[PDB]
From Swiss-Prot, chain A:
Residues of the full protein shown: 360 to 418 of 418
Top-rank taxon, per record: Eukaryota
Function according to Swiss-Prot or TrEMBL: Component of the 26S proteasome, a multiprotein complex involved in the ATP-dependent degradation of ubiquitinated proteins. This complex plays a key role in the maintenance of protein homeostasis by removing misfolded or damaged proteins, which could impair cellular functions, and by removing proteins whose functions are no longer required. Therefore, the proteasome participates in numerous cellular processes, including cell cycle progression, apoptosis, or DNA damage repair.
Name of this protein: 26S proteasome regulatory subunit 6B
Family (UniProt): Belongs to the AAA ATPase family.
TM ranges: none
Subunit description: Component of the 19S proteasome regulatory particle complex. The 26S proteasome consists of a 20S core particle (CP) and two 19S regulatory subunits (RP). The regulatory particle is made of a lid composed of 9 subunits, a base containing 6 ATPases including PSMC4 and few additional components. Interacts with NR1I3. Interacts with PAAF1. Interacts with TRIM5. Interacts with ZFAND1.
Record-listed N6-acetyllysine modification sites: 38, 42
Subcellular localization: Cytoplasm; Nucleus
UniProtKB/Swiss-Prot annotation, chain B:
InterPro entries: Ntn_hydrolases_N, Proteasome_alpha, Proteasome_alpha-type, Proteasome_asu_N, Proteasome_sua/b
Annotated positions of the N-acetylalanine modification: 2
Modified-residue entries (Phosphoserine), positions: 7, 14, 16
PTM annotation (Phosphotyrosine): residues: 6, 24, 76, 121
Family per record: Belongs to the peptidase T1A family.
Protein name, entry field: Proteasome subunit alpha type-2
Post-translational modification: Phosphorylated on tyrosine residues; which may be important for nuclear import.
Swiss-Prot record, chain G:
InterPro entries found in the cross-reference section: Ntn_hydrolases_N, Proteasome_alpha, Proteasome_alpha-type, Proteasome_asu_N, Proteasome_bsu_CS, Proteasome_sua/b
Compartment(s) where it occurs, according to its Swiss-Prot or TrEMBL record: Cytoplasm; Nucleus
Listed SMART domains: Proteasome_A_N
Protein name in UniProt: Proteasome subunit alpha type-4
Source organism (scientific name): Rattus norvegicus (Rat)
Gene from which this protein is expressed: Psma4
Residues bearing PTM N6-acetyllysine: 127, 176
Lineage, opening ranks: Eukaryota, Metazoa, Chordata, Craniata, Vertebrata
Function text: Component of the 20S core proteasome complex involved in the proteolytic degradation of most intracellular proteins. This complex plays numerous essential roles within the cell by associating with different regulatory particles. Associated with two 19S regulatory particles, forms the 26S proteasome and thus participates in the ATP-dependent degradation of ubiquitinated proteins.
UniProtKB/Swiss-Prot annotation, chain I:
Function: Component of the 20S core proteasome complex involved in the proteolytic degradation of most intracellular proteins. This complex plays numerous essential roles within the cell by associating with different regulatory particles. Associated with two 19S regulatory particles, forms the 26S proteasome and thus participates in the ATP-dependent degradation of ubiquitinated proteins.
Localization, UniProt: Cytoplasm; Nucleus
Stated name of the protein: Proteasome subunit beta type-6
Lineage of the organism: Eukaryota, Metazoa, Chordata, Craniata, Vertebrata
Annotated gene: Psmb6
Main subcellular localisation: cytoplasm
Species this protein is from: Rattus norvegicus
Recorded catalytic activity of this chain's protein: Cleavage of peptide bonds with very broad specificity
Length: 59, 234, 91, 246, 245, 219, 249, 238, 202
C-alpha cells in the first residue's frame, strides 16, 4: 500500500480509477491471474503529468 | 528601441477592502509550498517545504531558508523569481539600517518597505504584484517577533501562522495551539509537528528545511539535525 | 545499454533465433535460451517467433537432466502467449 | 492547468489567474517545446555533466553559436534549453550581467550566486508583459568552490533550487523520473561513469539514441575547474566503454 | 506555421500560446516571397551575390539594393521586406562604427552575430517596435579570425554557416552548396559558383529581368568590402549562363 | 588615531592596533575598538584618516553579505577590493582610507591593502599608516619563514605596542583580531599594559563659584 | 491588444467622472474605520485595525495609526497595501516642512499637498488612485486644534469630528450626536472614540488587539504624539462601557 | 476594421496593411516628374489652387541652394520630414563642408519613415519626395517613399498612372545627360501630361518648376515666372 | 616606478619585472604581485604606480570578459590594449603609468603590444617601459636581438629585472618575472633575499 502513494507526484481521486484501468491494460497482455505491484507502478509513471508547481502554475 | 504595451490600470476595486487581482494572488500562495512559522518566545523558528516535488533535492546552500543578515531570516511560500528579488532587496534594506543605526532593520520596518513595492506593482499598469508571502523573523526590542506580509502588501501580525496547502485551516489550528516559553530544542520539535500538519507526503531531510533565529544569530540547520527532531515527536 | 526502440534491435535478434534451432542439437540448447531471452522484450510480432523456439528447448532439455526446468519454461509460455499463432503450433 | 478567467484584462497580460498562473510564463513553457531541445543533467563529486542535443538543419555550419553549450564565465558553464531565438537573447543579457559581477566581485563566481543574478533579472521579465519573458530554460553546471559539483536549474520564470540531478526541455517530468532511478542506483562518481550515466539517460527517454558527434557534453571536472567542451573524441571514449558496460 | 490575424498579434508585446509569436512567423513569410540572395564562405574570403531588381532602364546602383557594408569590411546581404532591412542596416552601421572607435580592429563576426540576433529578438519583445521582416547574412574577411559567414533569421537565432542561401527555395540551394567542396576552392572559384544558383532558384512572378550584383571581400580587395573586381565578374558571368544550358 | 598592522603565520590574518578613538587630535575615548567587524568574518585594520576607512568598509560590508548568504561560502575579499577601487578612481582622489582588508576567501586566502588611490595588487603582509615601518620591524625580527597562530599573536601584540609608543593618540590596550574562515574574535582586551583611568583624589569646588536662581522641570 | 479595453482611468466616462475614482470609495467601505475627534487641549485618533484575526503579536504597533512626526498623526481607512507607500511619503513631508517652518505642521496645509498626489495619478500616469483615505490630526497656531480628512478623489475637508472607513454615514452622525462643537475634553473624548468603534466594525467584538488609540495632547513646551500601548487602551475599553450610559443620559 | 488599423497585424504575404495604405496616398496626390543630367537636376510638379482669386501653392520647397525637394501627398506630413531634411543637410554643410550627396541623405530619411510602420498605434506618413541634389560627382534624383525603399533614377515619375510617364522617360533616357537645363524641363512636361487624362494637357499656372545645380543656385518658378522654362512641349504623346 | 618588460620569443612571451609597490617615500608592500587578475587568460605586465595600473587593468577585465565569451574563449591583443588607451586619454599627463601587454590571441602568432600613458596602442618587437625605462634602456637593447630565443630570454629578462632593483631608488628586493602562454598566466620568483648584486663600483 505504501508504495502506491509514493510513485506519482500528482494524482487526484478521479485519476485512481484511470491508473487502475492503465495497469489492467498492460497486465492483460502478459495474460495474468493476479495484479502485480509491477503493473501499478508502471501505471503511475505513464500519464504521471507535469510538475506544475516548479515551473509556475499552482505555485 | 522603446516599449509601450499596457500602462492603464489593470486593477479594479472590489468591495471587500482589497482589489480583485490581489485576491487572486493570495490563492497563488495557497497553492504554493507549505511553510510554517512559530514564535517560541526565545527565538523564532521557521520551517519550509524544501521540495518543489520532483523529489530529487540536494541542498547545501540553495535553500528557501536564507539568512538576510545577522538576525533576520526569510522563508516564503509562492513564487521563486518574485522571492529572489525580495531577498536581494532585503539585504540592501537591512544594511541601509545597518549604516545609519549600526543595527539591522527591525521586523516592522522591513515590512513597511517591502510592502510599498508590492502595492506599486498593483496600481501601475504593465506590472503585476508579487505572488509571494513572507514569514519574517527577527530579534528586536529584546523580544522575538514574527510578521506576515501577504502578496497584496497588507500585513497581518502573527505569533503563529501557516501558509501553503491548507493555509486557511492552518491559521485556525495555530491560533488555538501557539506556544511560548520554549527551550531551543523544543522549538524545533514543535515546529516540525506543525509542518507535518500542513505538509503532506514524506518528510526525511531533503523534503523539509528548518531555520532558527535566536540570540546567537540566525543560521540554517544542517540536514542531519532536522531528521533527529522529526523522529522525536508524535 | 538502451532499448534502442523496439523495432530496430528486434529485427536482428529475430533472424539469428530462427537459424539457431535448426542447425545443431546439443550446443544449440545453451545458445538458444540466451538468444531467446533477448527476443522476449517486444510485445510486437516477436512473441510468435519466441514460441517456436521454446519447443526446441523442451525436447532437447528432456534428454538432459534439464527436464523439470523444461516443462516450467514451456508451460508458463503458453499462458503468456496465446498469440495469433497457428493451430498446428498451438496443439 | 488553467487558461485563466479575466476580471482585470488578464487575457493577453501576465497578471493573475485564480490558479496563480501567469499567462506569459505558461506560454514560455510552450516555447521550450518549439525548439525540440531536451537536456539531462547529472551531479557527481568528480564532475558536473550537462549533455544536450545539437541541431542540424544542414551540414553547412560553423560551431560557435550553433552550439547550445555557452561559457557564462570561465569556470561555471551552462546550456540553454528550448527555443534557440529566446536562448540567444537570454545568453546575451546574462553575459553583460556576468561581466558586471566581474567588476563587482572581482573573481570566479559561485554556482549559487550565478543562478541568483539571472533569477533576479528574469523577475523583471516575469512581472512585465511589456516585454514577454524569454521562453528558454537554463541548467547551470560547474563546481562551487568548497561544496563541490552542482547542477541547478532555472525555469523561464526563474525558479531555482538544488537537486541531486535535473532535466529541462520538452518535458521535464518524464525525464526526471527516468533520471530518479539513475540517482537511486547511485554510481561510483569518477569521470567515466558520471559522463556515461548522463549520456545513457538522455538516450533512453528519446528512444532514438545518438552518436557522440550528435551530442555536446560539457563538464566541469575537479581535474581542471575550467569549463571544457569534450568534443568529438573525448565523448567517443565514453560511448565505446558504454557499449561494453551493461 | 501558426498564425491567425485575429488574436495574439494585436500588440507587439503579446506572446502566442504556441511558444512562437505570430508576428515573427509573419516576418519569415515575407522572406519566403522575396528573391534569392546567396552568400558562400570561402577559404580566402566571402563572395556575395544578390539580385538587384530592374523595373526600368532608368535605374542605377542605388535602386533596389540589397548589398550593404555594415562596417567597411563586414557586408550584409538581405532578403525579404526591404523597408525594415535598410533601417536595420542603419542602426547596425552605427553599432559597427562605435565598436571600431573603442576596440580598434577588424571586428570578429562571431561577436556581431550574437549582438544582432539578440537585437532582432528585442523587437519581438517590445510594443513600440515590431519584428524585422528579413533574414540576412553577415559576411567578412579579416586576418583576426579569417573568413566568417553567419545568418540571422527574423526570429533572432544566429547560427554559423559554411555557405547559405535564402530565397524562394532555401532547401534546394543549400543541398547544391553541399555537393561542391569549397575546401578544394579558393575565393576565385567561389565567385563562379555563387553566380549560377541565383538564376535557377529564383522564379519570376514579380520580376521582369534582374541584374546580378556581386561583392567581394577577399583576396583582391584586401579585407575591405568592395564591389567585385572586373576580371572576377566576367569569369562569374559566363559560368552562370553556361549552367542554365 | 588608527595605525594598523597585520601578520601572517602561514594562514590568514591576526590584525593588530592599539585602541583610542579621537575627536580630531583630542581624545574622545581613551580606548574603545577601532579595528572593525564588517558583518561576521571580515575585519579591517585602518590607518590614515580613520573616517573614509569606516564608510567604504560599510558599503563593502553590504556587498559581501549578498554573496555569503546565497553561497554559504566565505566572505569575498576581492569583492570588497573592487568596490573601494571603483569609488576612489572617479575623482582620482576622494578621501584617504588606508585599509587592511582580510578574510579567507572561498578558494584561496586573500589579503588586501587598499591605499588612498586605486590598486588591484595582491600582497600577503602589509602594515599601514605612516608608522607601517614600526609595525614591520617587529615582524621582521620575530617571523623568519613559517610562524604559527600563537606565535603570530605574540608578533601582533608587539606591533600594537610600538604604535602606542610612536604616536600617543594610539594608547593603552593591544587589540588582537583573529580573522579566519569561520572564527572571528573581537574581545577588546588582549593585553592590558596601560589604561586610562579616573583620579583617586577629588577636588572640585561646590558653591563658591556656582550661581543658580531658578528651576523648573519639563519632560 | 489594449485598444479594445475599457477601464476609463484617465478617460472620462458617460458619467462625467472616472470609474476608478468612484470604485475606490466602495473598497474603503468594507475596511476598518478611523475617526478623529476634537478636544479642548488636544486632538485624538482612534482606529480599527485591518486585522480581524484573533491573535496578533504586535510586531508593528502601527497597523492603522502611524505617528509621522512629533507634531502629527495619521490613520488609514482602506487597504493596508496602498497605505504602506503613503506612510513613507508622509514621514518625509511631515519632517521636511518642519525643518523649514520650526512651528507644528498645519493640518490643512498637509492634506491639500497630499490630495494633489492622489488626484495626479487618476488624471495622468495611467495609475489608479490609492484606495486609502487618510485621516490627519495635527495642531497649528492659526486654526487651533485640527482634524482634516483626505480622499482618493482629491477632496479635503476641515472637520471637528468625522469618521471614514466602514459605515461612515452612521459614524459621523454618532460623533455629532455625542460630541457637539467644542463640548468634550481630551480624556472623555478618548472614551467616545472607542464607543463608536465597538458599534461599527467590519467584524464585531472590540478588543485591545483590534483597536489602536493615539493622543495628541500638548505637554509642557512640546506637542506630544504617542500611540497608547494595549494596556492603556484597555482602561479606555472599560471607560467606553461607562460612556454608553453617559451619551443617553 | 480594427485589424487593419493595427500596425501589428500582417497579411500571409508578410505585408503590414498600414504600409500598403501609405503607398497609395502618394498615388491620389498630384504627379511630379524629377530628372537629372550631368550639370543640373529639374523638379516639375503639378499645382492646385482653391479659387480663381488665389495663386497656386509651391509644391517645390526650398531647402538649400544646392539641394531642393518637391512634395506629392500630404503637406502637414511633408513638413515634419522637411524639418528633418533641412536639419541634416545644413549640419553636413557646417561640419563636413561637402555639398552633400543625395545618395547618403535619402537613406537616413528611409530610416525615419520606417519607424511608424514598426510602432503600434502609429500611422506611416504618406507623402512622396523627389529630392534633387547636386554634389561634386554631378546631379542625382532620388525618390524616397513612405517606406524605406529609395530609388536612384535618371528620371522618375510618381503619382497617378505613373508607369506611363516612365515609358517617355526610357525612350529619352540617354538624351537627358546631353540636354540642357531648359530642355530637361521640356522633357519633364511631356512626361507629366501622361499621368493625367488625354483629355487635358498642362497650362502655365499649374506647373511649378524647381531648378537645382551649383552652376546655378536654387530657384522656384511659381505661376507666372514658369513661362520661359515651359515653352516647347508636345500635346499628349501616345 | 618598477620596470616592466616583455621580450619576444615567437609563439609565447616572457616578461620580467621588479617588485615594490610604494606609499610615497616609503615602500608599503614588497610582497606583492606584478601580474594580478586582469582577466583569467590574459596577462599584462605591471609596475609603475598602483593606481595608474589599476584603473586600466579593471576596465580591460570587464571589456575582455565580454570579448572572450562571444568570440569563443581567447580575446584579441589589439582589442585589449585599446581599452587601456581610453583611461590614459583622460589622464594624459596626470598618470605617468604605461602598461606592457603581451599575449597570444586567435589573430594569429605572438604579438607584443605597447599601450602608452598618452593613449597610444602599437604592436612591435619588444619594448620595456615604465617611468624608469629611460634608465634601463641600454640593458634591454643589448639583450634584444632579432628573434631572441626562449632559453636566452630567461637569463636576459631576469637580469634586466635584477639590474633594476639594485640600481633603482624606486626598485626593491625580489624580481617577480611572468611568462605568458595560452594555458594562462604563470609567475615565478627569482630570489634576491639571497645575495645577488650587479657588481660594485670602486
Amino acid at each position: 500500500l505504501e508504495d502506491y502513494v509514493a510513485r506519482p507526484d500528482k494524482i487526484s481521486g478521479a485519476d485512481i480509477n484511470s491508473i487502475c484501468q492503465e495497469s489492467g491494460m498492460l497486465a492483460v497482455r502478459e495474460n495474468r491471474y493476479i495484479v502485480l505491484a509491477k503493473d501499478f507502478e508502471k501505471a503511475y509513471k505513464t500519464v504521471i503529468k507535469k510538475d506544475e508547481q516548479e515551473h509556475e502554475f499552482y505555485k | 528601441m522603446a516599449e509601450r504595451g499596457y500602462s492603464f490600470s489593470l486593477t479594479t476595486f472590489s468591495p471587500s477592502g482589497k482589489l480583485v487581482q490581489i485576491e487572486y494572488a493570495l490563492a497563488a500562495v495557497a497553492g504554493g509550498a507549505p511553510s510554517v512559522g512559530i514564535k517560541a518566545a526565545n527565538g523564532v523558528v521557521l520551517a519550509t517545504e524544501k521540495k518543489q516535488k520532483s523529489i530529487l533535492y540536494d541542498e547545501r546552500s540553495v535553500h528557501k531558508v536564507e539568512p538576510i543578515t545577522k538576525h533576520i531570516g526569510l522563508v516564503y511560500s509562492g513564487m521563486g523569481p518574485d522571492y529572489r528579488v525580495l531577498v536581494h532587496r532585503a539585504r540592501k534594506l537591512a544594511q541601509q539600517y545597518y549604516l545609519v543605526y549600526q543595527e539591522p532593520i527591525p521586523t516592522a520596518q522591513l515590512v513597511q518597505r517591502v510592502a510599498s513595492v508590492m502595492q506599486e506593482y498593483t496600481q501601475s499598469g504593465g506590472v503585476r504584484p508579487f505572488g509571494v508571502s513572507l514569514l519574517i523573523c527577527g530579534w528586536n526590542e529584546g523580544r522575538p517577533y514574527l510578521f506576515q506580509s501577504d502578496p497584496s502588501g497588507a500585513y497581518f501580525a502573527w505569533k503563529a501562522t501557516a501558509m501553503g496547502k491548507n493555509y486557511v485551516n492552518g491559521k485556525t489550528f495555530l491560533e488555538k495551539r501557539y506556544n511560548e516559553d520554549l527551550e531551543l530544542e523544543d522549538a524545533i520539535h514543535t515546529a516540525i509537528l506543525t509542518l507535518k500538519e500542513s505538509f503532506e507526503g514524506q518528510m526525511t531531510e531533503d523534503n523539509i528545511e528548518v531555520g532558527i533565529c535566536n540570540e546567537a544569530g540566525f543560521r540554517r540547520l544542517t540536514p542531519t539535525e532536522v531528521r533527529d527532531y522529526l523522529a522525536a515527536i508524535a | 545499454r538502451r532499448s534502442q526502440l523496439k523495432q530496430a534491435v528486434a529485427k536482428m535478434v529475430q533472424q539469428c533465433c530462427t537459424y539457431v534451432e535448426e542447425i545443431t542439437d546439443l550446443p544449440v540448447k545453451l545458445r538458444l535460451i540466451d538468444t531467446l531471452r533477448m527476443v522476449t522484450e517486444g510485445k510486437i510480432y516477436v512473441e510468435i517467433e519466441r514460441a517456436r523456439l521454446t519447443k526446441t528447448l523442451a525436447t532437447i532439455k528432456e534428454q538432459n537432466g534439464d527436464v523439470k526446468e523444461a516443462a516450467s519454461i514451456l508451460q508458463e509460455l503458453q499462458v503468456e502467449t496465446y498469440g495469433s499463432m497457428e493451430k498446428k503450433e498451438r496443439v | 492547468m488553467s487558461r485563466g478567467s479575466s476580471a482585470g484584462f488578464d487575457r493577453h497580460i501576465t497578471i493573475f489567474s485564480p490558479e496563480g498562473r501567469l499567462y506569459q510564463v505558461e506560454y514560455a513553457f510552450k516555447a521550450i517545446n518549439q525548439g525540440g531541445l531536451t537536456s539531462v543533467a547529472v551531479r557527481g563529486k568528480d564532475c558536473a555533466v550537462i549533455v544536450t542535443q545539437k541541431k542540424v538543419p544542414d551540414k553547412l555550419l560553423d560551431s560557435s553559436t550553433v552550439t547550445h553549450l555557452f561559457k557564462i564565465t570561465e569556470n561555471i558553464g551552462c546550456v540553454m534549453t528550448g527555443m534557440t531565438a529566446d536562448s540567444r537573447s537570454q545568453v546575451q543579457r546574462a553575459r553583460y550581467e556576468a561581466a558586471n559581477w566581474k567588476y563587482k566581485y572581482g573573481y570566479e563566481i559561485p554556482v549559487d550566486m550565478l543562478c541568483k543574478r539571472i533569477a533576479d533579472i528574469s523577475q523583471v521579465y516575469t512581472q512585465n508583459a511589456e516585454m514577454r519573458p524569454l521562453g528558454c530554460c537554463m541548467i547551470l553546471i560547474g563546481i562551487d568552490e568548497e561544496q563541490g559539483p552542482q547542477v541547478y536549474k532555472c525555469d523561464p520564470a526563474g525558479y531555482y533550487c538544488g537537486f541531486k540531478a535535473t532535466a529541462a526541455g520538452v518535458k521535464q517530468t518524464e525525464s526526471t523520473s527516468f533520471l530518479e532511478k539513475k540517482v537511486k542506483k547511485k554510481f561510483d562518481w569518477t569521470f567515466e561513469q558520471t559522463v556515461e550515466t548522463a549520456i545513457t539517460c538522455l538516450s533512453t527517454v528519446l528512444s532514438i539514441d545518438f552518436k557522440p558527434s550528435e551530442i555536446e557534453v560539457g563538464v566541469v571536472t575537479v581535474e581542471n575547474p575550467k569549463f571544457r567542451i569534450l568534443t568529438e573524441a573525448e565523448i567517443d571514449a565514453h560511448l565505446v566503454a558504454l557499449a561494453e558496460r551493461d | 506555421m501558426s498564425s491567425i490575424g485575429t488574436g495574439y498579434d494585436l500588440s507587439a508585446s503579446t506572446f502566442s500560446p504556441d511558444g512562437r509569436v505570430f508576428q515573427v512567423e509573419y516576418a519569415m513569410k515575407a522572406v519566403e516571397n522575396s528573391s534569392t540572395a546567396i552568400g558562400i564562405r570561402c577559404k580566402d574570403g566571402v563572395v556575395f551575390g544578390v539580385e538587384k531588381l530592374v523595373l526600368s532602364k532608368l535605374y542605377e546602383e542605388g535602386s533596389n539594393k540589397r548589398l550593404f557594408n555594415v562596417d567597411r569590411h563586414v557586408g550584409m546581404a538581405v532578403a525579404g521586406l526591404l523597408a525594415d532591412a535598410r533601417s536595420l542596416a542603419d542602426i547596425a552601421r552605427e553599432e559597427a562604427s562605435n565598436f571600431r572607435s573603442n576596440f580598434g580592429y577588424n571586428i570578429p563576426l562571431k561577436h556581431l552575430a550574437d549582438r544582432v540576433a539578440m537585437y532582432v529578438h528585442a523587437y519581438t519583445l517590445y510594443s513600440a517596435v515590431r519584428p524585422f521582416g528579413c533574414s540576412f547574412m553577415l559576411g567578412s574577411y579579416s586576418v583576426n579570425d579569417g573568413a566568417q559567414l553567419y545568418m540571422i533569421d527574423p526570429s533572432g537565432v544566429s547560427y554559423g554557416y559554411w555557405g547559405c542561401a535564402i530565397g524562394k527555395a532555401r532547401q534546394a540551394a543549400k543541398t547544391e552548396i553541399e555537393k561542391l567542396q569549397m575546401k578544394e576552392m579558393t575565393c576565385r572559384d567561389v565567385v563562379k559558383e555563387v553566380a549560377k544558383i541565383i538564376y535557377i532558384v529564383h522564379d519570376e512572378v514579380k520580376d521582369k529581368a534582374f541584374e546580378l550584383e556581386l561583392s567581394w571581400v577577399g583576396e583582391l580587395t584586401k579585407g575591405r568590402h568592395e564591389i567585385v573586381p572586373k576580371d572576377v565578374r566576367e569569369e562569374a558571368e559566363k559560368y552562370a549562363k553556361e549552367s542554365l544550358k | 588615531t588608527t595605525i594598523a598592522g597585520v601578520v601572517y603565520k602561514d594562514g590568514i590574518v591576526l590584525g593588530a592596533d592599539t585602541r583610542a578613538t579621537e575627536g580630531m587630535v583630542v581624545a574622545d575615548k581613551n580606548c574603545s575598538k577601532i579595528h572593525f567587524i564588517s558583518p561576521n568574518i571580515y575585519c579591517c585594520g585602518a590607518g590614515t584618516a580613520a573616517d573614509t576607512d569606516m564608510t567604504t568598509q560599510l558599503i563593502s560590508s553590504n556587498l559581501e553579505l549578498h554573496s555569503l548568504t546565497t553561497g554559504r561560502l566565505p566572505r569575498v575579499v576581492t569583492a570588497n577590493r573592487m568596490l573601494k577601487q571603483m569609488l576612489f578612481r572617479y575623482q582620482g582622489y576622494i578621501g584617504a582610507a588606508l585599509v587592511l582588508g582580510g578574510v579567507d576567501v572561498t578558494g584561496p586566502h586573500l589579503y588586501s591593502i587598499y591605499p588612498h588611490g586605486s590598486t588591484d595588487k595582491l600582497p600577503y603582509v602589509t602594515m599601514g599608516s605612516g608608522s607601517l615601518a614600526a609595525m614591520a620591524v617587529f615582524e621582521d625580527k620575530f617571523r623568519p619563514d613559517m610562524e604559527e597562530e600563537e606565535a603570530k599573536k605574540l608578533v601582533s601584540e608587539a606591533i600594537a605596542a610600538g604604535i602606542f609608543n610612536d604616536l600617543g593618540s594610539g594608547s593603552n590596550i593591544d587589540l588582537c583580531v583573529i580573522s579566519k574562515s569561520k572564527l572571528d574574535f573581537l574581545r577588546p582586551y588582549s593585553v592590558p599594559n596601560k589604561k586610562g583611568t579616573r583620579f583617586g583624589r577629588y577636588r572640585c569646588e561646590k558653591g563658591t563659584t556656582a550661581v543658580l536662581t531658578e528651576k523648573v522641570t519639563p519632560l | 491588444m489594449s485598444r479594445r479595453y475599457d477601464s476609463r482611468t484617465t478617460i472620462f466616462s458617460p458619467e462625467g467622472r472616472l470609474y476608478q475614482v468612484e470604485y475606490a470609495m466602495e473598497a474603503i467601505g468594507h475596511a476598518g474605520t478611523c475617526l478623529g475627534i476634537l478636544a479642548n487641549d488636544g486632538v485624538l485618533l482612534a482606529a480599527e485595525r485591518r486585522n480581524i484575526h484573533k491573535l496578533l503579536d504586535e510586531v508593528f504597533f502601527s497597523e492603522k495609526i502611524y505617528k509621522l512626526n512629533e507634531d502629527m498623526a495619521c490613520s488609514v481607512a482602506g487597504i493596508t497595501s496602498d497605505a504602506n507607500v503613503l506612510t513613507n511619503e508622509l514621514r518625509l513631508i511631515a519632517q521636511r516642512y518642519l525643518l523649514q517652518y520650526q512651528e507644528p505642521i498645519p493640518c490643512e496645509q498637509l492634506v491639500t499637498a497630499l490630495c494633489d498626489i492622489k488626484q495626479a495619478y487618476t488624471q495622468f500616469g495611467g495609475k489608479r488612485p490609492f484606495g486609502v483615505s487618510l485621516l490627519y490630526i495635527g495642531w497649528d497656531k492659526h486654526y487651533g486644534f485640527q482634524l482634516y480628512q483626505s480622499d482618493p478623489s482629491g477632496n479635503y475637508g476641515g472637520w471637528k469630528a468625522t469618521c471614514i472607513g466602514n459605515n461612515s454615514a452612521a459614524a459621523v452622525s454618532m460623533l455629532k450626536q455625542d460630541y457637539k462643537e467644542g463640548e468634550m475634553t481630551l480624556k472623555s473624548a478618548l472614551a467616545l472614540a472607542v464607543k463608536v468603534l465597538n458599534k461599527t466594525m467590519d467584524v464585531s467584538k472590540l478588543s485591545a488587539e483590534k483597536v489602536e488609540i493615539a493622543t495628541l495632547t500638548r505637554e509642557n513646551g512640546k506637542t506630544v504624539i504617542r500611540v497608547l500601548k494595549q494596556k492603556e487602551v484597555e482602561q479606555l475599553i472599560k471607560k467606553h462601557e461607562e460612556e454608553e450610559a453617559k451619551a443617553e443620559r | 476594421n480594427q485589424y487593419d488599423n493595427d500596425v501589428t497585424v500582417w497579411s500571409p504575404q508578410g505585408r503590414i496593411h498600414q504600409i500598403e495604405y501609405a503607398m497609395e496616398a502618394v498615388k491620389q496626390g498630384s504627379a511630379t516628374v524629377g530628372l537629372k543630367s550631368k550639370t543640373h537636376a529639374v523638379l516639375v510638379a503639378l499645382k492646385r489652387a482653391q479659387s480663381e482669386l488665389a495663386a497656386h501653392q509651391k509644391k517645390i520647397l526650398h531647402v538649400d541652394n544646392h539641394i531642393g525637394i518637391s512634395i506629392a501627398g500630404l503637406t502637414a506630413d511633408a513638413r515634419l520630414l522637411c524639418n528633418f531634411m533641412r536639419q541634416e543637410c545644413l549640419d553636413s554643410r557646417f561640419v563636413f563642408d561637402r555639398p552633400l550627396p543625395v545618395s547618403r541623405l535619402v537613406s537616413l530619411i528611409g530610416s525615419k519613415t520606417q519607424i511608424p510602420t514598426q510602432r503600434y498605434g502609429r500611422r506611416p506618413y504618406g507623402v512622396g519626395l523627389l529630392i534633387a541634389g547636386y554634389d561634386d560627382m554631378g546631379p542625382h534624383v532620388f525618390q524616397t517613399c513612405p517606406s524605406a525603399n529609395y530609388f536612384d533614377c535618371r528620371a522618375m515619375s510618381i503619382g497617378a498612372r505613373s508607369q506611363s510617364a516612365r515609358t517617355y522617360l526610357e525612350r529619352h533616357m540617354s538624351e537627358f545627360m546631353q540636354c540642357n537645363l531648359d530642355e530637361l524641363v521640356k522633357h519633364g512636361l511631356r512626361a507629366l501630361r501622361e499621368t493625367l487624362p488625354a483629355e487635358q494637357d498642362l497650362t502655365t499656372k499649374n506647373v511649378s518648376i524647381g531648378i537645382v545645380g551649383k552652376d546655378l543656385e536654387f530657384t522656384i518658378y511659381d505661376d507666372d515666372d514658369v513661362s520661359p522654362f515651359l515653352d516647347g512641349l508636345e500635346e499628349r504623346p501616345q | 616606478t618598477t620596470i616592466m618588460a616583455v621580450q619576444f620569443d615567437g609563439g609565447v612571451v616572457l616578461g620580467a619585472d621588479s617588485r615594490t609597490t610604494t606609499g610615497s617615500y616609503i615602500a608599503n608592500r614588497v610582497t606583492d604581485k606584478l601580474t594580478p587578475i586582469h582577466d583569467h587568460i590574459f596577462c599584462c605586465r605591471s609596475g609603475s604606480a598602483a593606481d595608474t595600473q589599476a584603473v586600466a587593468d579593471a576596465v580591460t577585465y570587464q571589456l575582455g570578459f565580454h570579448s572572450i565569451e562571444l568570440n569563443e574563449p581567447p580575446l584579441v591583443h589589439t582589442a585589449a590594449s585599446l581599452f587601456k588607451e581610453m583611461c590614459y586619454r583622460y589622464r594624459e599627463d596626470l598618470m605617468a603609468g604605461i602598461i606592457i601587454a603581451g599575449w597570444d590571441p586567435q589573430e594569429g602568432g605572438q604579438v607584443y603590444s605597447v599601450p602608452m600613458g598618452g593613449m597610444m596602442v602599437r604592436q612591435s618587437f619588444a619594448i620595456g617601459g615604465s617611468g624608469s625605462s629611460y634608465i634601463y634602456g641600454y640593458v634591454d637593447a643589448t639583450y634584444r636581438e632579432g628573434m631572441t630565443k626562449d632559453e636566452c630570454l630567461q637569463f636576459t629578462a631576469n637580469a634586466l629585472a635584477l639590474a633594476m632593483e639594485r640600481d633603482g631608488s624606486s626598485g626593491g628586493v625580489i624580481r617577480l618575472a611572468a611568462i605568458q602562454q595560452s594555458g594562462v598566466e604563470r609567475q615565478v620568483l627569482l630570489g634576491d633575499q639571497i645575495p645577488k648584486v650587479t657588481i660594485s663600483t670602486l
